[PDB]
Structures are given as C-alpha cells and as structure tokens.
C-alpha cells in the first residue's frame, strides 16, 4: 500500500457481512418517504431531492 | 560485632544496656521479661538485644601481645 506502520489503526467494515435485506435499508437512502426526509433533511432540501 | 549506641529505627540509646541485659538474663530473668524490665516498650528497639551478635569476643581472642 505504501503507508507507514505507525499511523494505522484497527477499524471495521460496515458494509462487510450484512444481510441482503439490512444492507438495502442502511445504504440506499430511500427518496420516496417524504416524512423521513423532513425528519432528517430540512424543508428546502426535501423538495429538491424529490 | 559490638552493641550499637542507638536503635536504628527509633534512636533510643541501647548501647548502655547490653551488659545489664546479660546480667538480668544471668540472674533468673528471661528475655521476655528482661526487655521490659530494662525499659524497652517499642518492639523496634527490642531487636538490638535479641538480634545482636557479640563477635567482639572472638576478635579479642586474637590478642596482639601477651
């Protein structure tokens, strides 16, 4: 890789070993449920993403 | 080799008590009563009369002259 061994730390891969169903409901960003978008994004973004 | 002058831990003078300790052990008294008959209450000063070895006698056996 070309990296020094000092600045490396243990981590985890979220997208490694999900289930097919859970992987779809965690990394897809459903753009149909406008209520969730209003809860998460602001009003001036839900209309833009829809 | 010789009795110290003072107890290492406390500092009470114990040098002037070896001969008296020997005499009290000599007459009839035993150690457990001799130590408090001499006036040693703390246990730190009691090792000076119990743990001490009297090696000066062997050294004096090698008289230089006569």
């Amino acid at each position: 890789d070309g990296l020094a061994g000092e600045s490396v730390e243990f981590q985890n891969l979220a997208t490694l070993k999900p289930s097919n169903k859970a992987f779809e409901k965690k990394f897809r960003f459903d753009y149909t449920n406008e209520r969730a978008l209003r809860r998460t994004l602001q009003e001036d973004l839900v209309k833009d993403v829809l | 080799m010789i009795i110290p002058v003072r107890c290492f831990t406390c500092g009470k003078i114990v040098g002037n008590k070896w001969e008296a300790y020997l005499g009290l052990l000599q007459a009839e008294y035993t150690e457990g009563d001799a130590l408090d008959a001499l006036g040693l209450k703390r246990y730190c000063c009691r090792r000076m009369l119990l743990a001490h070895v009297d090696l000066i006698e062997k050294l004096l056996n090698y008289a230089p002259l006569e």
Binding site: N33, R35, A36, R39 | -
Partner: protein
C-alpha cells in the same frame, strides 16, 4: 428562570443489584405528577436517604434567580443570591446523551436524559414534553431538598 425541570419524587428502592461502592448507591425513585423514572446517585455518606422519603428535585441551568448563565468555575466569594440557599444537596454535571423512542416518521413520545455529575449518573426517563430544556453538551444542576412531610 432557567428551571429545566421541577417535580416531587419519592424513593422506592435502593441498590437493587446490591450496593457496589461504599459512598454511592442507586436511587430508583418515581415521580408523583409527571410519572417519570429516576436513577439518581447521591452520596449516601454525607447525605443519607432512606426509603419512602420525598424530595423536591429541580434541574436548573443556573443557580441565580435572574439567570445570568455563569461561565462555570468555583468562586466562593460571591454575595449574589443563589437558589442553593433552600436546598440541602446540590450537584453540578453535564448531560451527555438524550435517548428517546424516536422512529423514522413520527417524533418521539418518551425521552431519557443521561447526565453525569463528574461520575454520579442519573437517568430522568419519561415523556418527551417536559424534557424540552435538555440538550446534549450542556451544564445543569440538581437542587434537591428532602421533604419533612
């Protein structure tokens, strides 16, 4: 004002998984009007408490009546009025987690304020209506007084 919360509680159980430490214990208290849980940890040594006792807990953001939002530091030499004059047990901490029963569509109905007073924890679990004054990373007080009744 700065009164983030005010309600009467009463103690019903003390260290129910067994007392771990020697100066702190769990106080699984309950409310009387708002019907909310309480897991306060008081210093049982200096401020003993027994079961059945009632106290007036008031989470306040500041100790001053006028609410000047003190910076936060020990300044004993202060002649200004302090709300702690009518309380037998005052503490100072910083809420760090506000958990609730949120979902993806409809807002939460019950929150849970987790505040740590430098080591002594408390969970003020209950409805999501009276906990509007709690925000993560904010200093708060305790201001309890045992009721003689």
């Amino acid at each position: 004002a700065g009164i983030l919360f005010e309600d009467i509680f009463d103690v019903k159980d003390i260290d129910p998984e067994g007392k771990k430490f020697d100066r702190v214990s769990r106080l699984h208290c309950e409310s009387e009007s708002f019907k909310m849980d309480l897991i306060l940890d008081v210093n049982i040594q200096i401020y003993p408490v027994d079961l059945g006792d009632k106290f007036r807990l008031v989470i306040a953001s500041t100790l001053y009546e006028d609410g000047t939002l003190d910076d936060g530091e020990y300044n004993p030499t202060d002649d200004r009025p302090s709300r702690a004059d009518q309380f037998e047990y005052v503490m100072y901490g910083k809420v760090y987690r506000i958990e609730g029963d949120e979902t993806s569509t409809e807002a939460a109905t019950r929150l849970s304020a987790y505040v740590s007073y430098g080591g002594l924890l408390m969970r003020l679990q209950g409805d999501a209506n009276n906990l509007h004054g709690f925000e993560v990373d904010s200093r708060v007080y305790l201001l309890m007084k045992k009721l003689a009744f």
